[PDB]
Amino acid sequence: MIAKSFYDLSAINLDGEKVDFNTFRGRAVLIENVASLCGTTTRDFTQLNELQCRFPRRLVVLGFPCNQFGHQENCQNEEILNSLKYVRPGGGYQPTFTLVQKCEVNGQNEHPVFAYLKDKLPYPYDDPFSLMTDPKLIIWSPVRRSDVAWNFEKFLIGPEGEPFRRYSRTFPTINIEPDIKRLLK
Amino acid sequence: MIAKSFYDLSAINLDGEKVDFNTFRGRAVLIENVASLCGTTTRDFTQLNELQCRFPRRLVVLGFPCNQFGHQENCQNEEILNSLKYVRPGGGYQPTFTLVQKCEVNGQNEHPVFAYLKDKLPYPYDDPFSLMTDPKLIIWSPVRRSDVAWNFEKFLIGPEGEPFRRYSRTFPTINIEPDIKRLLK
């Protein structure tokens, strides 16, 4: 099931174009599962833009929209940029990083990128034990101990393709920067 | 708990203004629970506008946004018109009918208007028995036999204040018109 190399992976962006992970060689990669109508939407989306603009050549920031966490991404793929631009964050917000087509990160149909990353990094560094306060919010099947717990978990991979660290829903995106710098030395 | 008269009810619109149901005397009233990012959002929103424009003086159409059904209204109150205008239906869509502040229609905190209507009209005329295929989508407490089953159930009340009929999630909004005409004779 699981990719042998990070670089064997791929994804489809919102324009239907393939994102080939071979293009990530020599670059640090930040992957987050994202949601357009989450409580931390505005903050994480602003901070994802900031990070990508700070490291425009040496970092790839990639966001995977997902509706598994409080159903906070009910948009069709063709509606997501509109919602970000006009609703939340709103105010003309546009992503400067790559958003991919909506996927599942947990369960039987989880995206191969997330199967791979959860296998390499089975829990968040900052909060290894929490999964969910309200068990009703676990809606996928099967449920595994390594599952993404909410919108905006974060996976940092180094420039040689080795996943480095996973960060929880409570770990601010912008606070990943010191580890990005370290990996880019 | 339950209002003695339909006309004793009220609601708050999205601008924070009170909608006093006494203003509905002599008018037929169509109340739907609505959601901005539902599969039948575009159709019901278009059809609600059409009905209100067809009966601008003799009908009040009132929509209650609610996030209890697949969490298909995660917008804050101040984001709902933007989402309708720019996302879904999109294309500059504006409601011609009154939208109220987001509420709960089922459970312990259900809006007084819905407590009243479900009491007068405990099941949909066209589908009295269905409640939910997937029991995981029942997220409120307590659960009652008269509960709203999904986004866009419909309650028609006559010009003398007596609730007349309830219609299910599958009953098209525009197909309520013959009953509106009948009640307005």
Add this chain to the structure above:
Amino acid sequence: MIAKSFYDLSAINLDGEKVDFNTFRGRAVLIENVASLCGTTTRDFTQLNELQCRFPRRLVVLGFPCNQFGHQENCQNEEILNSLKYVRPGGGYQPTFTLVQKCEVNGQNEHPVFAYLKDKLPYPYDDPFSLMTDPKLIIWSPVRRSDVAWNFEKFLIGPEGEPFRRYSRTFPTINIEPDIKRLLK
């Protein structure tokens, strides 16, 4: 789907023998869904025996074990009498009424007897609206407004085969007696 006559129904008892509902002609019938390890197990089981012994020829009491309500019947069919005899009620308790093989009363695989009865009697007389306080306890699919709400709902059918009344989880079995007498006049 639904039987045309009450008398077209049947069930299999714990000894694997067919219970043909034609044998109920001219008799009142009390049907309950039962559970061996419920909070009201001892009371309802004692009261079901008492009623059957009071009307040994003119009443049939029939209990349908079911595991859909808090999973309070996990016994295999061959373990149920042992559990009643030695655990709860315990003390050598034996049913004087007919127990049938464990079934489902709600959802896609609901027993034909319960499909029929819920159709004729879609809510409890004494409590028409309650379904469930904790939505997590609704575990079947699909969920319908007429569904059995907990262990020990009660359905009384008259001697000419017409279902008469349904009673809720809170209505004591022994309090059905006045209606049995009335139906037997």
Add this chain to the structure above:
Amino acid sequence: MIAKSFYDLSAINLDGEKVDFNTFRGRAVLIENVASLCGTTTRDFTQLNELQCRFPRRLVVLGFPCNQFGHQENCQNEEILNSLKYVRPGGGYQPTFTLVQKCEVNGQNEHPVFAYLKDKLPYPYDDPFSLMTDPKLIIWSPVRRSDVAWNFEKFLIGPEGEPFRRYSRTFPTINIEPDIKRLLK
């Protein structure tokens, strides 16, 4: 929250007597969460007896009844031995090991012994990733990545008080013996 030493723990047996974990010094300890009406009840209960009889002085086998997994322990404490003796396994079965009072192993009210053990041994050795196929069976709060996954997970602790290994719902009790022998060398 978590005990500093395994030996600081205690439990109450079914007779209401304190089981002081200081009495476990110099002994290997096998702790399982158990259920009287599970699919693996007969096998695990037979195998728990066998292990205790094989190491009557050097091993303590301790079973914690728990109703969190398919509600397969609905018995009151005073009914459990009867159910084991007369229902399942039945046939006069009596435990030769210590059963404690029914508890919760997961969530806010989890037993201190299980808080301690899941902290020392956060996943099963033989199956580190599985948690639950059907998310509806996760009924406790909060849900943590280290949670017990079903009836009959197994925790082996060495004679000096250091938890050694955790085994999953699919790992046979009797197959823990080689590790018991190793710990007792």
